[PDB]
């Protein structure tokens, strides 16, 4: 009964609500947001019967949920093909959110390379990944069906970083690059250009891998 | 028991509960409605987390009671965005446009008396766009099934809202024809706007129905 009402909230919040306690809206000084989008999906889904695209979405969801569940991240929403995954949000963990998300991005890049579309087998699916780090305020909205929600400008900065990114590449801002470099062991390359979405003096980086 | 399939439409939920299986379908005509709050990023950026969480709860409670009066289906709700379609699960002729237009007018009426708890002397500004066209639908997801839509009319229904105006209902030229063959709706031409997809195209405003 209650186990099917708290199927969207994180496990910590689900246990908090189950035992009767109240969950307050909170502010977090640093969380890491990851935004992913499949490029060229409205053209591949424009030349398929209604069953092929449904099956492709089912297969992609089942493939991604088996990799997202390997880490400490929490998947906020999944509409269409876009994915939004946040780390550090429900229970704080210091500065490990950047490392967990940057490892999950490489894992998801490796998982896509073996994904097979069953109505065009000799073809690979392209992906776009953008990561950002910043403070957000989060809380539970809804009463008929509860849902964890986030507010802050870092969400839209992460979405914009994903939008400006390239296919099959991981696009980091300069706020998360500092954290990753301080942790050490990652490979980051300066993009060599400054984006023109909301500013003109912002430097962005490509993530290439980890040692 | 009731909350087993609370996300899916009543028809699809009953079909799954009975025991049968559902198939992806192609719909010849479906009407989509997209709305959002203009200026919400600058209003949640000067309020404490409890204020904005309670505001979101109030807004959801206000809108979900106006929606239930009409024959429509609420697809998704993220942040302040709202997506509502009609004609989708059970075809009902050309009645989707009329129901969606009536719902849009009722939602515009109901947001004039909405009260923000932490600023009583201010009202929220809505932005609404409506489109009609062929879309496909299917139930995707395992262990968490959900209805979803594929097509290009979703993109244009969203673009109509993105190019719209606050406290005004924007219509394409595809739904104006349906509403003028219905008769009884006051439509005023906006002009040859420059849509982000094609370019020079005629769109309209909706001002009210004469009863
Ligand atoms: N639930 C929603 N689905 C949408 C929306 N806009 C588009 N779509 C649908 O989801 C899919 C994504 O389309 P996008 O708007 O992201 C356009 P496209 O995929 O060409 O962009 P890129 O993949 O970034 O090149 C596509 O099938 C659309 O029909 C929206 O606002 N909400
Ligand atoms: N949970 C989510 N919240 C989002 C998402 N995208 C945006 N947002 C939140 O909603 C806020 C609204 O930003 P939008 O991009 O919708 C722009 P706004 O609504 O302020 O309208 P204009 O400024 O008139 O374009 C945004 O800054 C975030 O706090 C998303 O994918 N998921
Ligand atoms: Mg896409
Ligand atoms: Mg908004």
UniProtKB/Swiss-Prot annotation, chain A:
Question: Which factors induce or repress this protein, as stated in its UniProt record?
Answer: Expression is chronologically prohibited with ages.
Q: Which residues form the Guanylate cyclase domain?
A: 32-162
Where is this chain's protein located in or outside the cell? Membrane
> What post-translational changes are documented for it?
Phosphorylation of the protein kinase-like domain is required for full activation by ANP.
Outline the subunit composition. Homodimer.
This chain's function reads: Receptor for the atrial natriuretic peptide NPPA/ANP and the brain natriuretic peptide NPPB/BNP which are potent vasoactive hormones playing a key role in cardiovascular homeostasis. Plays an essential role in the regulation of endothelial cell senescence and vascular aging. Upon activation by ANP or BNP, stimulates the production of cyclic guanosine monophosphate (cGMP) that promotes vascular tone and volume homeostasis by activation of protein kinase cGMP-dependent 1/PRKG1 and subsequently PRKAA1, thereby controlling blood pressure and maintaining cardiovascular homeostasis.
What family does the database annotate?
Answer: Belongs to the adenylyl cyclase class-4/guanylyl cyclase family.
Task: Please report the name of this protein according to its UniProt entry.
Answer: Atrial natriuretic peptide receptor 1
The species is Homo sapiens (Human)
Q: Give the shown range, full length included.
A: 845 to 1055 of 1061
